[model samples]
Target chain A: LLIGVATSSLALHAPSQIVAAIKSRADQLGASVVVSMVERSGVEACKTAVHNLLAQRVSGLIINYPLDDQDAIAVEAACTNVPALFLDVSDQTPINSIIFSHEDGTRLGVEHLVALGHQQIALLAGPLSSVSARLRLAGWHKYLTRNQIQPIAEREGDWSAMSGFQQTMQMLNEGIVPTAMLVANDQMALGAMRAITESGLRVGADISVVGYDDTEDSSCYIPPLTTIKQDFRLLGQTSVDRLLQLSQGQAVKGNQLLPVSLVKRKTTLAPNTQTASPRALADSLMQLARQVSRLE
Target chain B: LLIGVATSSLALHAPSQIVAAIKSRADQLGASVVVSMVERSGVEACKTAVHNLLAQRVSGLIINYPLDDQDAIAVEAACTNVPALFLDVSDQTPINSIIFSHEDGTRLGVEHLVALGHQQIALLAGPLSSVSARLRLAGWHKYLTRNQIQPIAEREGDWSAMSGFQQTMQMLNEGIVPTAMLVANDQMALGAMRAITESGLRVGADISVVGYDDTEDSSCYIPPLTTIKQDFRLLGQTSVDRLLQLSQGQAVKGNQLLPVSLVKRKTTLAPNTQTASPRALADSLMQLARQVSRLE
Candidate 1:
């Protein structure tokens, strides 16, 4: 099978990892793969990529939200790849999406914070204009409401460390202190770490932080960043499998949800007010995390 | 004209930036740009990239030295992409080289540390096996010999943050702490930052540090790293201009060298016991840096 996969910035660790995964899986499956990646993430960029990939005459197409949920053109180009980047789905939509547990993965960030006895949790979200960002926000709201905790604050970072740094810097300067921050991605999470440090707050002690997309650099960050792990291997294996299924002209049904796990690192700590010390638990979780890290 | 360009991993910000620059220039020059990037750097990888780019019927070629200084194949391939990669030249070197002020760039890093009144500086060099690494070491040795100061400690890292982190970690554990560290790249500097922080020292305070390759993420680093900048735009502009010059059946004689500059940020501080303040000089240098940063 010849597949065309359109994705986002290869400069970012996640996108590159995704591309690598897809390539590796396609190689094992004896399939040809061509990829088109834009430096920026958005519909216009995605549109350009989609056109290029299609021009390459790929028999099967796999994409990661080339168009927003509301984009009319996206509605016309049926695609299946990566995680679910959809807000709402209908029978009218013709694509068989391999939806990963992204929103569910969002829960892992907040859940870890809340479990650590943090009530004043803030969120540094990606651009809300994007469908994926909106979905993640909904997940944040869902979890917060379930726990009956009002958000300490919310800010937007355009999936970049600078935006994350600026937003967190602004929040701190305004005297809005949060016990923990649930950042949308690891880059922003790193930004938040710097922001916290500059504000005279220790990342793990004074304010805990969590980020999504456990990039390779996450483990190497000054205080090894605690992040939500998106399994690129699963992403690749599943995406290749789904595309192969489609090429066979077989009836493809049901969306797939890949598991997302929380990677514990030095960036997170239990609130000092916790009834019991979490050191022992943290030690055991460390072993579990090592196993998880090894698998990835 | 069809121009074939080969670079390293997109996962590396510089390599990707290099690829992006060439493509941008090629687009403006109305040339077809074909790319070949090998994630692994080596003679075999370089050979593979060259074969593929050549196979694409590309009339022109640009490539990074994918092999070590010791690579027989590399000696045979004759690279001329990044200006600073080459040590010497022969008439048989098939391509035109775009030289950057790399050795001079190395001096900017050390001079900044020395100017801040630091004497007991350590060296965190890249692997000695690589030609590029040797050039940087020469720069280090040149400055040190000129200043008549002996290196307090020296270590090697293979252009990886992990290697940098481990090297610094080992030194600190071994009780060999220098007043300042001259790191090879921003990645290693980042790793050193973590190691320093873990060792109960603040990066810009306890021990000053400087890094080469002011990566896109450098400013967002915990202490906003003080680093040496690479002129990719010039590399692209010059390389493309030179390649086009050749395509026009013109002789492009000498290699081109673009200037490199130092960026003063929070990571370097005037040693606590400096005889005089550096802020005045630092301010003027900042102005120079802004003008430099504005160029690309």
Candidate 2:
């Protein structure tokens, strides 16, 4: 039998884990996966993608968002009996959701900044329309207001490191450097960090940065990033685990919120007077090195 | 009609551009692409992927390899008339090939080290069995032998930043620091740079590093990496271009070598005796700050 893994994009960096999880789960069940992309074509395209997969008789369907609200309803409702999994979409629906809690992830990042003693924080967000991205923004907004820390600025990125770099260029170029910048994900954080470094600023010392996804390479990001780590493997494992379980019998229903954590690396610190100069204790970044140095 | 794309892996950092290109190319033609992964099953997996996609009655097929020679022959023979594009597979075939001259890419990297006045350079290569990966290694070997330079060391990576980082740790720990490190690609270079930094060494100041693929985040790497830039968009454009032309029954044969160039950023420089302290022209990294400072 075949399972369909519907994704927003097949870009290498974007869906690595999601695809892997779906495929891994399918592999063990002696089923094949037909991965589809529908984001670039718009909501109508996504609706059609859902139809095609189900029409082809995909045993189960796993999809993430960038799906329009109506598109979400159309998708989940179309294949209601096919053990569908709607990942990273917050809308209430009959299908099961296996997602990293974006709101909590944002809260974790912002709270980490607060812990480091920064009252002024900014956010580098992914596409605002993405439910997952918006949830992160809302989470930090809620967290910041509760902590009484008004942010310095905000900008949009299409979830790429280059977008983060470009957005940061405008900020630093225009003279708006926040004590800390909470980025939506690690790729954009990469850009933000590069921008900070190029501007003759020390990432952790001059300006503290927080990233999400704790991507494998995040630790190697010069000043290992302080990020909200999402276990993609676990995310995948749970997704497959839940999907496979449903295939045997399809009555399961609920929004599953996966836990995330903060990784304190060299890229963040308490607000310092240097304003882009080296600010963090050298020791904060050392912890990662100490942990990884053992691998050699 | 559909264009089938068979690739080895879909990890975020590995060859996103190639897949993007093929998809984009197909999209522009009002055609669709069915992308597949055959990394896990090896030569047999790839062979089956080709058969399955063709059996799905795709109008054309674009495939990347780790595919066995016999398997490739079987795939091509089975689809005698469908437009076929073999990426990075140099065997004389009945198809069109649009590949960045892997040998030349390596040659360019090795030659860059020579230009940087480094006689002792080390190579951190990708998996040796991959035809594409081996091409880079062979290119470097040819260049080094031709230049009469004795490369200091060599290692293999699974095209991951972590692999690069781990290999580098061993080098630093063993006290075998080359004047320069020629990494096969940018992701691995990311790890290599972090490893250098963890050792309290400066990237451009103390040791120079060069990377291939100038991936989206390569420029954003803290000390921007010097890299070989491949035109994935163009790669996509041409693959679709040729395949479509062939569909109209045009004779399009021969291996197309796409032109690639070097992007110099902050990560590399001439070999200087800085003893792992800070290196590179101090102002280059500062100029980014200097530019942003103007906004203030």
The numbered model that scores best in TM-score is 2
Scanning candidate 1 chain B in windows of ten residues, the lowest lDDT window is B82-91
What is candidate 1's fraction of native contacts?
Answer: 0.25
Among the numbered candidates, top lDDT falls to: 2
Off by more than 4 A, model 2: A10-12, A39-41, A78-83, A91-95, A245-247, A273-296, B10-12, B68-71, B74-83, B91-96, B247-249, B273-296
Model 2 docking grade: acceptable
lDDT of 2 by residue, A82-180 (tens): 778888577454447777776678777888888888987788898887777888888888989988877888888988888999999899767788878
lDDT of 2 by residue, B1-296 (tens): 57777766546464556776677666677887666666556556776667766655678878766544455566566565777777756544434666787766777888887877788788888888666677788778888999997678888887888888989888877998877898888899999998888888888766788998888788788788999887778877888777777667766576777787888887777676522222333354345446344324
Give the root-mean-square deviation of each candidate in angstroms: 10.3, 6.3
lDDT of 1 by residue, A161-252 (tens): 78888899898767687889988888887788888776546788877898888876677788888888888778877877776666565646
Q: Output DockQ, candidate 1.
A: 0.16
Best candidate, DockQ-wise?
Answer: 2
Q: By TM-score, how accurate is candidate 2?
A: 0.89
Docking class of 1: incorrect
Give the distance in Å from residue B46's predicted Cα in candidate 1 to where it truly belongs.
Answer: 2.5
Against the native complex, each candidate's DockQ, computed on alpha carbons, is: 0.16, 0.33
Candidate 1 lDDT tens digits, B1-296: 65666555435555555655665676578765554444454657665656655654566677665345345236335433312222122212333456557578878887887887888888998877555566777788888878878788889997778888999999888988777899987888889988988899877767788988787778888889988888666666777767777656665554555688888888888774552134423433443343333223
| Each prediction's whole-model lDDT (CA) | 0.68, 0.74
